Amino acid sequence: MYHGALAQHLDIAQLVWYAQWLVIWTVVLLYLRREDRREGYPLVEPEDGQVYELPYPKTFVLPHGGTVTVPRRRPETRELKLAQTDGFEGAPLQPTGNPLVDAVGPASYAERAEVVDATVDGKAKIVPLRVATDFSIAEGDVDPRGLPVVAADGVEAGTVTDLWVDRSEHYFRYLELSVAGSARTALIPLGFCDVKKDKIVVTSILSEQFANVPRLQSRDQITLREEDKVSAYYAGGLLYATPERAESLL
Amino acid sequence: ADYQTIYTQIQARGPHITVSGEWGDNDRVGKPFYSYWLGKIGDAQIGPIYLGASGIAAFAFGSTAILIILFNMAAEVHFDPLQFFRQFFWLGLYPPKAQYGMGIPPLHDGGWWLMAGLFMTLSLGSWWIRVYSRARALGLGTHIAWNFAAAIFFVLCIGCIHPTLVGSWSEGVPFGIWPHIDWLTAFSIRYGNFYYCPWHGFSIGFAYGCGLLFAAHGATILAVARFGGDREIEQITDRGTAVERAALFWRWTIGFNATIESVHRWGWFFSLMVMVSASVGILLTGTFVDNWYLWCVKHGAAPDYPAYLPATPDPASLPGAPK
Amino acid sequence: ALLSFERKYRVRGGTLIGGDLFDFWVGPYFVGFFGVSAIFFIFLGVSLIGYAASQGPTWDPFAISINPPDLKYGLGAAPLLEGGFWQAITVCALGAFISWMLREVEISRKLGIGWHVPLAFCVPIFMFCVLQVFRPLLLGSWGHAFPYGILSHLDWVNNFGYQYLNWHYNPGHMSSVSFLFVNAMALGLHGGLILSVANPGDGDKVKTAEHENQYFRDVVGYSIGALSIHRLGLFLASNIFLTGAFGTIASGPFWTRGWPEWWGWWLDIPFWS
Amino acid sequence: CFEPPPATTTQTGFRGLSMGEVLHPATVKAKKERDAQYPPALAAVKAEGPPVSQVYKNVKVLGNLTEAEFLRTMTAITEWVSPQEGCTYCHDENNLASEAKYPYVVARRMLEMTRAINTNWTQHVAQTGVTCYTCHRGTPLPPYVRYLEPTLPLNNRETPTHVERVETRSGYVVRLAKYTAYSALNYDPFTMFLANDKRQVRVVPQTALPLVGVSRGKERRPLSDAYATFALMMSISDSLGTNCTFCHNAQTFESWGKKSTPQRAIAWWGIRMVRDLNMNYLAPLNASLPASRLGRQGEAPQADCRTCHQGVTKPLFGASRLKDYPELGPIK
């Protein structure tokens, strides 16, 4: 006679073993996999399947007033300048106009809040240095202010005039530059910047495409949606800046 | 490629932020200093550190333990300091070598071990309170404290809960670099090869999972750094192209996907699971299973290979064959 | 079929090879040249596995084991039933793993994002090559590889480790273990933190980046930051295999005694000997 | 620090189990040469004359051989145990039958041991058998002996450092570690398993579920037994210069049959053979050797696996004199 034996040669272990897969599959399929559907669902074309797969909308009580509740239905009835390359269901779309300006493909932005991202206090989070005057480029890093911006065509495009700092974390998120010969200032995310000792190289877009970088509303603050629009613009460059960038690398 | 993912090209400095808690804002001590090199891959600011009651208690108990170990170790090389620094790794405070069951063993045989055990338990608990309440004080969920509980439990299991269940202190983990490592094998050997304990597998499954997940999740966020994917809270409360592109990556690759919030739940779960699984296995071992290998043989899962060198009969059960 | 927001991203382009030819989806799945080659390899592989398992002694998923050839065969081709299947299946898994990684690249290109994922995926693929190719090459025989079998591969790990008396003392292993542990812990904290901030509960208010950092500064004096934890994560986890590979590649080709003994360089410095 | 490739590998288990030896050609060759200094057997002198049990005064054990034969054995006995010291090492140069010097009484005790080994423990030594050389390797004191406490260096033909000297207290853990392949196993496998036969090696349960009445509290073997067996297996492994896969398929240390190599059985008999060697022959000699040869508790020096194997799986790589000196075994 042994410890952990149960009638008809089942042992405690063997049970706990089934119990464990049960617990794991519950949590995976019933809980986690449902949570995964709090965004983007339900798919675009009231069947049984679709009620079963979502969870009960949770509600976020926002820090600076309001609520957001997910999942919720969010129809993208923004215009899309895309035509189809073929008949079949799985075929790709493609831009009819200027993808970068039309905001399609790798160049698309989300319908984020037309709001300004705030600090724990209220002041706008992403502000240029001319406002956040108590913030500095740190002890011994390149100060890009004044340096030329050089686009993918190796042609000069503008001049860096300001850095925009996230105030909540202490982190620089964009450079603000001046589009040479357009009487306009443009933002570029530091992700797209090779920051040298004597210049800033950007390979996302060609120089003369700096012209059309989405413009901000106020000039000393930026909206969550504007941040996407801007980020998205340069991203679009990777694939669209020339006819050859959409093609195959090898 | 986005250099910003590799290191931070241009650091920024500003006044140090403080978020006010519901208590002990007065216990934060320290002169928050910065660090250029730390800033290239992290946040430059170090400190200030929050004290608090529980935090101090942890250090009290913790060092009592460390002292009790370190002293038994210095004793083990007869208090000669040069040998102690040389043989460090090999030195240990061990549990009772003889079978005293659940009775308090003599100091010369696992008495001190049981002592340091207790103080480390005390230390661990204290530190939990700190981890727990800090979340409370700042108005945050207690996910971290719950997860950390799993880890502490597992330590209690291999520490004393198991020894208790089989009723012998000899079964606990020795304090010491090599000695605690040796235990792993003495324990696996004793219970019939841990490769064959299913919970060992579950725990390993999840631990590799965390490897897979963090590797994947982290890579994902960096790949969408250009859209501020890093700004996770707001991507949660206001989905943006960053997590849209993240999601569509995975969806186009593996056929499904998560949400910037949900993934952290996967992550959190997998972590939690490593310790829960570990604990479940240890609980069963000795109590309800004696040889994990034979147990898998009993349920017909263990594989078998043909002989290569000739098979070799236990000579101990030959006719003839001495003691 | 598409996610609420997916339609706009579904443009043509990004491929490494082929162009428009395989540039399309099938369900949620992106195909591409490498999705095609990937499928071809997965099909051969699972076939070879399934078919070779059938000359096996059992159908129990836990006991099925398909093993490499005997040492004597060296680096040459082995008869199917004596590790030939194993060799084929190994070539298939490598073709698949690579297709899969290259495919992920095309996907990141269409999406205009970082290649950080396929890149990180090279770590796991690399370590697999260390185990089934590089070390085997260094010791002169495919026979040194691990067998394909749910439990049986553990048997190999077991024996491989005891071939060195106590694999725990392998310094490359000590490293790798520690990364494994710490990474699992980091994923706990990071995943936990975000959740602790978006989900304070009681219908309290969602908190701030400031709160994130505040939390750790308090508990341990430091806080690495949001974009930073993500990098640290990729690093910790990648190192499980990046350092571990040395411990593996070293056992045999560069060291033939128990690992404990290797610590003689320390224990036996004549100074304190 | 890091031995360069290639490495000689052998296969001891079914393909795909990573069972087998892993060897450094350099280190093998070095031992092959140290082990090659086994003196060749003397040319054979034919059987003529009368049994020496009358022709000599004090010949207890070897009394069946002619004087032609008996002298040849004494020539070999000399090469093996003291080729430096001549015959006069055990004898008096005039009084050859004199048990004057103690190496005489002992060498006899050894003669029976050798003969017992090659006759009874053929399950271990088989066709190879031992001679005085196997252990002595050209010196009265064999290089690898053990006392009732761990000692260093393992080869006594080297000068101990201060900390190696058994009197140094702080040097303990390291004397212990080096007996156990450098592990930190707080156990001395020799006194525990090899001196006598008090302890049982096996520690793993033979059934899948815990047997009632030996699985709870004060009725259980402590976990420490497992540690200690692990120590013996470290030690043994090192003594033959081999790894666990030489004998075990790690999938289950506890199982024989297909899970064990034939060398595992051989090793099993070896453990018994050592216990006999030690308890009945070597340990008693403490009442016949200089107090200087004894240990810190008057123990005579004794044998572990190393004593014969000295780092090789078969001692002297299998070299045998069994046919050349049949007076040593097996006794017909």
Ligand code: BCB
């Ligand atoms: C050097 C040491 C190694 C090791 C040591 C090891 C241990 C010690 C253990 C495992 C375990 C596991 N290993 Mg093994 N392993 C496995 C696969 C696996 C799983 C059977 C299981 C859980 C792993 C997991 O959850 O990861 C995280 C990934 C997750 C959670 C995503 C899901 C992946 C899915 C679970 C894996 C699917 C495996 C398929 C059954 C096999 C492939 C199917 C074929 C038909 C295509 C693969 C595919 C490989 C490859 C390709 O190299 C591999 C290599 C290795 N393992 C190394 C040789 N592994 C555990 C086990 O219980 O095995 C029985 C266990 O304890």
Ligand code: BCB
């Ligand atoms: C030959 C013996 C072996 C063995 C023996 C073994 C045992 C006996 C156990 C494991 C366990 C586990 N093993 Mg296994 N193992 C594992 C992986 C795993 C882990 C996933 C898992 C959990 C242990 C852990 O995470 O501790 C790390 C985490 C810990 C220790 C929690 C500590 C957190 C703590 C709260 C923090 C406190 C720190 C304080 C600051 C310290 C201060 C103290 C001061 C005051 C003194 C792998 C991948 C392999 C491979 C690839 O071979 C393997 C092979 C082996 N294991 C061999 C088969 N292993 C455990 C398990 O799950 O069994 C089912 C277990 O019990």
Ligand code: BCB
């Ligand atoms: C007695 C023998 C032991 C042993 C033997 C051992 C060896 C021999 C090795 C390790 C190694 C390692 N061990 Mg160790 N070990 C470890 C942990 C670790 C791992 C971190 C590490 C590398 C794992 C690996 O090789 O993944 C490999 C996994 C891979 C390559 C996965 C491949 C991914 C692939 C590209 C994708 C898979 C595709 C799927 C088929 C897809 C399936 C389709 C489905 C899912 C849709 C722990 C925590 C412990 C504990 C707690 O005791 C332990 C004890 C032991 N190990 C024992 C002492 N261990 C390795 C190491 O680095 O040592 C230094 C190694 O070689």
Ligand SMILES: C/C=C1/c2cc3[nH]c4c(c3C)C(=O)[C@H](C(=O)OC)c4c3nc(cc4[nH]c(cc(n2)[C@@H]1C)c(C(C)=O)c4C)[C@@H](C)[C@@H]3CCC(=O)OC/C=C(/C)CCC[C@H](C)CCC[C@H](C)CCCC(C)C
């Ligand atoms: C899969 C999920 C896992 C997981 C989970 C989690 N793990 C957590 C948490 C969660 C969630 C936390 O929330 C908590 C934490 O804090 O996160 C920041 C924590 C913890 N994980 C630690 C270590 C760890 N986790 C391991 C394992 C896993 N964890 C697994 C993998 C391992 C392994 C495996 O080895 C290790 C070693 C610590 C960092 C921390 C405990 C602090 C403590 O308990 O301190 C104890 C108290 C002490 C005082 C000890 C410190 C003493 C020093 C030497 C100071 C004394 C010297 C003094 C200054 C000199 C005085 C001089 C004077 C005379 C003038």
Ligand SMILES: C/C=C1/c2cc3[nH]c4c(c3C)C(=O)[C@H](C(=O)OC)c4c3nc(cc4[nH]c(cc(n2)[C@@H]1C)c(C(C)=O)c4C)[C@@H](C)[C@@H]3CCC(=O)OC/C=C(\C)CCC[C@H](C)CCC[C@H](C)CCCC(C)C
């Ligand atoms: C250090 C960093 C690590 C890391 C990181 C990352 N990990 C990734 C990625 C990244 C970044 C991806 O991007 C990619 C992915 O998309 O994720 C969702 C992926 C993936 N990680 C898998 C398994 C996995 N990761 C492990 C470990 C780590 N992950 C470490 C920790 C481990 C173990 C055991 O440790 C496992 C088992 C798959 C789920 C998936 C491959 C899909 C595939 O490859 O499709 C193509 C191939 C198949 C679908 C099956 C192959 C069919 C072949 C021909 C026949 C099979 C033969 C096989 C050899 C037999 C196995 C025997 C077995 C019993 C022993």
Ligand SMILES: CC(C)=CCC/C(C)=C/CC/C(C)=C\CC/C(C)=C/CC/C(C)=C/CC/C(C)=C/CC/C(C)=C/CC/C(C)=C/CC/C(C)=C/CC1=C(C)C(=O)c2ccccc2C1=O
């Ligand atoms: C006869 C035979 C067998 C051969 C046929 C083979 C066969 C299957 C072919 C099918 C033919 C088809 C349909 C056509 C071809 C189309 C094609 C190329 C598709 C290939 C199909 C295929 C092989 C599918 C397999 C997919 C597969 C490898 C899935 C494995 C998934 C697993 C287990 C991974 C574990 C990772 C894991 C735990 C993730 C859970 C959470 C997730 C989803 C994290 C991902 C994720 C992370 C990590 C974020 O950080 C994140 C951040 C912000 C937003 C979102 C996310 C996010 O989604």
Ligand code: HEC
């Ligand atoms: C092992 C140490 C040892 C050495 C070396 C040794 N002897 Fe002996 N000798 C003995 C022992 C022991 C005996 C007892 C034989 C017996 O009891 O069977 C013995 C017996 C003898 C006897 C018989 C004594 C008698 O008359 O009763 C002779 C003669 C002899 N040895 C000659 C030699 C010669 C010649 C050599 C050198 C070639 C030699 N011995 C070297 C130990 C030794």
Ligand code: HEC
């Ligand atoms: C199984 C290993 C082994 C074998 C085989 C062996 N010896 Fe010994 N011998 C020992 C040990 C152990 C001692 C005790 C330690 C010591 O005194 O050196 C010893 C002691 C001796 C001594 C005394 C050494 C001294 O100066 O204190 C002599 C002489 C001797 N043996 C002769 C022989 C002869 C002759 C043979 C062949 C019959 C032989 N030995 C075979 C292991 C062995």
Ligand code: HEC
């Ligand atoms: C030289 C052959 C040999 C080698 C090498 C060897 N073993 Fe053993 N092992 C044996 C024999 C024989 C026994 C049985 C002893 C007995 O029962 O008297 C045994 C017993 C064991 C046991 C006890 C199993 C039970 O039935 O309770 C374990 C565990 C073990 N060995 C592990 C190891 C480890 C770990 C190593 C590597 C450090 C190793 N062995 C190397 C021959 C060997």
Ligand code: HEC
């Ligand atoms: C009396 C000297 C002596 C002692 C002591 C000794 N051995 Fe042996 N060993 C031998 C001889 C002689 C052989 C014969 C080798 C052969 O068969 O070719 C051998 C063979 C072996 C073999 C078989 C090697 C092979 O490749 O087949 C193993 C395994 C072994 N010994 C293990 C041990 C272990 C374990 C111990 C300690 C318990 C030990 N030996 C102690 C003399 C000894």
Ligand SMILES: CC(C)=CCC/C(C)=C/C=C/C(C)=C/C=C/C(C)=C/C=C\C=C(C)\C=C\C=C(/C)CC/C=C(/C)CCCC(C)C
């Ligand atoms: C009735 C009462 C008295 C009995 C019950 C008391 C009780 C609950 C006992 C249980 C005790 C427990 C849980 C013991 C568990 C101990 C365990 C798991 C120890 C495991 C590993 C310990 C190790 C590796 C410690 C090594 C220590 C040293 C090298 C010296 C200490 C110095 C350090 C810097 C600590 C290392 C910290 C690390 C980050 C490197």
Ligand SMILES: COC1=C(OC)C(=O)C(CC=C(C)C)=C(C)C1=O
């Ligand atoms: C969400 O972002 C995170 C941080 O910054 C805000 C951290 O400091 C930390 C903790 C930092 C260290 C060094 C443990 C974690 C785990 C994290 O996830």
Ligand SMILES: CCCCCCCCCCCC[N+](C)(C)[O-]
């Ligand atoms: C051994 C550890 C267990 C980990 C479980 C692995 C989780 C993978 C979940 C995939 C879910 C598949 N799907 C699309 C149906 O959700």
Ligand SMILES: [Fe+2]
């Ligand atoms: Fe994250």
